[PDB]
Structure 1
Amino acid sequence: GVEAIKRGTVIDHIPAQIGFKLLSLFKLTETDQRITIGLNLPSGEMGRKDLIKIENTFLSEDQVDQLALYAPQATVNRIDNYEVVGKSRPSLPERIDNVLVCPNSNCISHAEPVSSSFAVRKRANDIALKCKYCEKEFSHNVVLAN
């Protein structure tokens, strides 16, 4: 894993092959700021990890929580003046607004200008994701597949 930027977020120990999902998904790539991405690194235990450094951008509490389904052990270090002045972990959110697709093909959502929304519930063992529109409950296993 690497070294210094002044000010910015460092998201370390993102599993491996998830570091790109997160970039792709939450569009962290549409800034003008330097971003450094490191893929399939050692220096985090598991050996293999992805890491993302976005300078001058700091992620909010809820943005931190959007990582949770993907990278639940991600540490979101807050850097100011070259040093880590804060560390957060992703907690589970109540609503994963925007990034998932309801597996129910007759949901109105598919065809339309609406951002998806699912109420998240139950911790770790099974996460049930309930679509806002069709009000159908699904195992995160199915939603997080197509």
Structure 2
Amino acid sequence: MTHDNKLQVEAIKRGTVIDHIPAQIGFKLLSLFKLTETDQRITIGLNLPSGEMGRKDLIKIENTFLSEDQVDQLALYAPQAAVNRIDNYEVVGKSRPSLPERIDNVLVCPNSNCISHAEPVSSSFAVRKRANDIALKCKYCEKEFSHNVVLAN
């Protein structure tokens, strides 16, 4: 959108703006999804006065749009996050994270005897909701864990 305390601040030309990320979850997302790995002008605002929502994180990836699928990968980490598509210095699109069905190579199988650990494979867990508690199922060992357990690693 438009940041201004009193002092002149940037807003990418065309690109995406992942705004409303909760404090401390921002950088993880940058790490996890390896978002920083391009030649694009990324501007990050950490620990910003979200006031109503206290403190938030914020990313702006200029000249880079995210497929709705990529937007869904944020759910477990930042569900209240709003993903804005910007064109011509204006919000042309406003998406919101949604529970995916599968979350690839970002989580680690808590099952220590899971073949997934040594070998060259990407993690892959099938998501499944229950009274709003997310159980996650490893593609390999086929075991089901609670997201609390998996996310801890």
Is the strand fraction higher in 1 or 2? 2
Cα distance change on mapping 1:27 and 1:123 into 2, 3 Å: farther
Identity across the alignment (%): 99
Preserved contact between residue 96 and residue 118 of structure 1 (Cα < 8 Å): yes
Preserved contact between residue 12 and residue 76 of structure 1 (Cα < 8 Å): yes
Task: Give the unaligned 5+ runs of structure 1.
Answer: none
Preserved contact between residue 92 and residue 123 of structure 1 (Cα < 8 Å): no
Aligned equivalents of 1:61 and 1:127: distance in 2? Answer: 20
Cα distance change on mapping 1:44 and 1:89 into 2, 3 Å: farther
How far has the Cα of 1:34 moved from its partner? Answer: 0.3
Cα distance change on mapping 1:91 and 1:61 into 2, 3 Å: same
Cα distance change on mapping 1:127 and 1:115 into 2, 3 Å: same
Which of structure 1's runs of 4+ aligned residues deviate more than 3 A? none
How far has the Cα of 1:131 moved from its partner? Answer: 0.2
How many corresponding residue pairs? 145
Cα distance change on mapping 1:31 and 1:123 into 2, 3 Å: farther
Residue 48 (structure 1) aligns with: 55
How far has the Cα of 1:4 moved from its partner? Answer: 1.8
How far has the Cα of 1:43 moved from its partner? Answer: 3.8
Aligned equivalents of 1:26 and 1:144: distance in 2? Answer: 14
Q: TM-score, normalised by structure 2?
A: 0.91
Q: TM-score, normalised by structure 1?
A: 0.96
How far has the Cα of 1:124 moved from its partner? Answer: 7.2
Aligned equivalents of 2:132 and 2:90: distance in 1? Answer: 36
Cα distance change on mapping 1:103 and 1:68 into 2, 3 Å: same
Cα distance change on mapping 1:40 and 1:66 into 2, 3 Å: same
Preserved contact between residue 10 and residue 77 of structure 1 (Cα < 8 Å): yes
Preserved contact between residue 77 and residue 84 of structure 1 (Cα < 8 Å): yes
- The aligned runs of 1:53-132 (5 Å cut-off) are 53-122=60-129, 125-132=132-139
Residue 3 (structure 2) aligns with: none
How far has the Cα of 1:45 moved from its partner? Answer: 2.5
- Whichever of the two has the greater Rg, that structure is 2
How far has the Cα of 1:42 moved from its partner? Answer: 1.2
- Provide the alpha-carbon RMSD of the alignment: 1.2
Aligned equivalents of 2:124 and 2:11: distance in 1? Answer: 37
Partner of 1:127, secondary structure, is strand
Aligned equivalents of 1:123 and 1:71: distance in 2? Answer: 19
Cα distance change on mapping 1:58 and 1:125 into 2, 3 Å: same
Aligned equivalents of 1:127 and 1:139: distance in 2? Answer: 6
